[PDB]
Design goal:
The structure is cut from a larger assembly and holds 5 copies of chain A and 1 copy of chain B. By secondary structure, chain A is α+β, with helices and mostly antiparallel strands. Chain A has 2 helices and 2 strands; from the N terminus they run αββα. Chain A has a two-stranded antiparallel ribbon with strand order 1-2. In chain B, the strands form 5 sheets. In chain B, strands 6-9-13 form a 3-stranded mixed sheet. In chain B, strands 11-10-12 form a 3-stranded parallel sheet, with no helix packed on it. The chains are: A alpha+beta, B alpha/beta. Chains in contact: A-C, A-E, B-C, B-D, B-E, C-D, C-E, C-F, D-E, D-F, E-F. Strand 1 of chain C pairs antiparallel with strand 3 of chain E. It is classed as virus.
Chain lengths: 49, 411, 49, 149, 99, 99
Amino acid sequence: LLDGLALYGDPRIADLSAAYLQYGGNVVREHVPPGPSHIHRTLQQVEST
Amino acid sequence: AQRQFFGLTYNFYGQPAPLFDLNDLQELAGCYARPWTSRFSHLAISTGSLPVWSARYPSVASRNIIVNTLLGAHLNPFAGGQVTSHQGITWRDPVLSSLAPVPAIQPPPVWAVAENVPLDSNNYPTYVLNLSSMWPINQDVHIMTMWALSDQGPIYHLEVPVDPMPAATTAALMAYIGVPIAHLAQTAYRFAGQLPQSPDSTMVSTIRWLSAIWFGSLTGRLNRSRTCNGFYFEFAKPALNPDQAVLKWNDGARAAPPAAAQSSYMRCISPHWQHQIVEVAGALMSQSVTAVTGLPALIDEATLPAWSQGVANLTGNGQGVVPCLDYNPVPMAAARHLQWRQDGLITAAQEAQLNNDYTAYALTIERHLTAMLVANPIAAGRMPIQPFNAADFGQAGQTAAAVALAQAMFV
Amino acid sequence: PLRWPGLVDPNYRVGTNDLPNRITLYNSLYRYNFTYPTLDGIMYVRSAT
Amino acid sequence: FMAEMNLFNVARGNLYLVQTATNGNWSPMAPVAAPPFVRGGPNVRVVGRFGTIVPRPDGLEPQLIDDGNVPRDIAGDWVYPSDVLQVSVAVFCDYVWPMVKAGRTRVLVELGHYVYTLHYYDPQISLDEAPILEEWLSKINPAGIPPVP
Amino acid sequence: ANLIGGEVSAMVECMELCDALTLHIRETYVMLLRSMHQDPTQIVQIVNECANNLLNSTIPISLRPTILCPWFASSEDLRLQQVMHLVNISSNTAAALPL
Amino acid sequence: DIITRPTSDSIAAVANATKPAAVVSDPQSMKVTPIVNPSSYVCNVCNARFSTMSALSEHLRSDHRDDASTLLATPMINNAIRSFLTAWDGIRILSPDVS
């Protein structure tokens, strides 16, 4: 489900992104910011209280 | 709960008698020969998205129109205090469960034909006694009145308070994420239909907000970049599924509440509504709220047709008289697209395309209706669709004021 | 009484609460009765011509 | 051959299906009156290319999808291209055919040429042609069809 | 009583022994599910489009007030899911062959 | 019960004398087959064929029950698709897994 983030690389993630490099030096990068979560909101509420 | 209501019957368009026949009275979609709580029975079970219509019910509004005309001939108890019969047909019982041929024992007096008769529930005392079982009559009569008052499209009411949306309503609202508007209207109709409800209620306030939210999204003022309270209505491309607008919740920005309380009456000023589902859904949904809570205030007579001038408990021209705005869908769509590009959801090139698509789509609606009218002349005896003139498709109405209200409403 | 506003307060709105500061024990809520449909369908193939 | 195909048990033109209860003479292979509801006539509907049907709730009877991709009322006059029939004989046998037997609708089957077959009967005793047709329908499939009886 | 499915209501509003915090969690979970809700009527169009209009289909369904079909997912979720696939594969790229 | 004093014999004899048959064997019969086929029964929502009215009644009494049946929690939740029917040959396809 999420293992690759822990098993390989640095887990300190910020915002995932994938890209490909063209020989002409141009870089095409596609960000994938997550959509509106719901559990995160209530979790932050739980922490606050 | 509300214990009294008022109403008004339809107006004959020069014809001498109410415009329906016995077969119409025999082919209602609900229980046999009863008009109550039947305005959605023809689509309780559905498949696909195609609108449902037939040879003698050729428009989405046709069935409701027929039902309204049908009721006009049998609502005498709320005017004359007595049950009557018309063409040998009357109610089974004083509770008005359903219609049936007159029995040959104690035939009730024959109804005298008339139009636009004002209605008052207090003329029929048994209604108060049997309120728990006669409740759906309240909703349907109110709905009929809200349509009878207009020559061009059903009238309904909008309002937004100065306070933010109360928490209790938010709890109820979330049950309806991702459901299209038509389904919501069906649910709203069922709610106010079965049992009596107090005007104060979480559910009542919930639906009222829904009506406001949808209008805000209809103008494009409310969108995924500017939500009411996280809520807004999503839209599909008009070139396909032009009506499958659904409710969405989002974590984005919220519009600030208005400076003062806003409220107005609304109407569609063009015949397009007769075959466009969303207009019917929005109108019925708003009317459902007014049905349980009654009319907040009298309606302005100024822009209404002749027979609607000065109805006792309905229309007026005094001080506490809420004005009524009207609009045309096509310019409304143009405004909605303009809001989207201003808010940056789309580029101007798309906005030009969307207007072309919608105008083409609207043209088919006009072309369908105008051809359907000549197929069902009103002089035949029944009025499946409301008459109109070709120029009525081009009227802009008060559309500019309408979008101005929404901008003043959600800010 | 601070933990029971929804029970002993005449000025208690429905559904309100001061969650970030303290926890109340008696509250109003919605209980749901959702339905979970299943689909059976018929598919038609296009004619030859 | 194109002028004498009948001698090879091959017929030309379309096929009609109308409930007719005659008492006198009958001559299906040489009609005398002009056929009704020729294609393109008033209130004549042609089926959609899928031959699909749609149900309706609470009393409303089903509707059929025409070429214009619009549900239409079953009663009346209808035109079936043979191919649509070959892929939708079941729904036809279940919804349209009973209405035909009730005499509330008329169907024109479009098929340029076909093999026919005859069945003679005594005009004196009673008879009902429906079972023969119902059998003939039962043997149609997407592959092929039996000769017209 | 509201939205009576013949005998029983679709949802009720009651007050009972209940702590706000747990209630807050439960409500959000409902909001999550409803966010996944899909209108069933659109399925037939989804099928017809996915079939490149080679198939035409009908799926009748009754429309009750409370009805849940948690089948929808936004493009963002799928795009994120795709990226997640690359990450989990990263240690052994050869694992993608079975696709 | 209620008394049933038998009538006089002569009246009975006269009545019994005049009793034409109800049905006769007449070649000419203008016979007419039933409008609806009575040999098979189809489920109007899933088009499952059946041999008797009883069997069809039970099938809809099980497979097409829209009841809000249980106030207790449902033991299971099914997937979206249960089955499909191919019209062109009347073959029903079952989802490899609906549960």
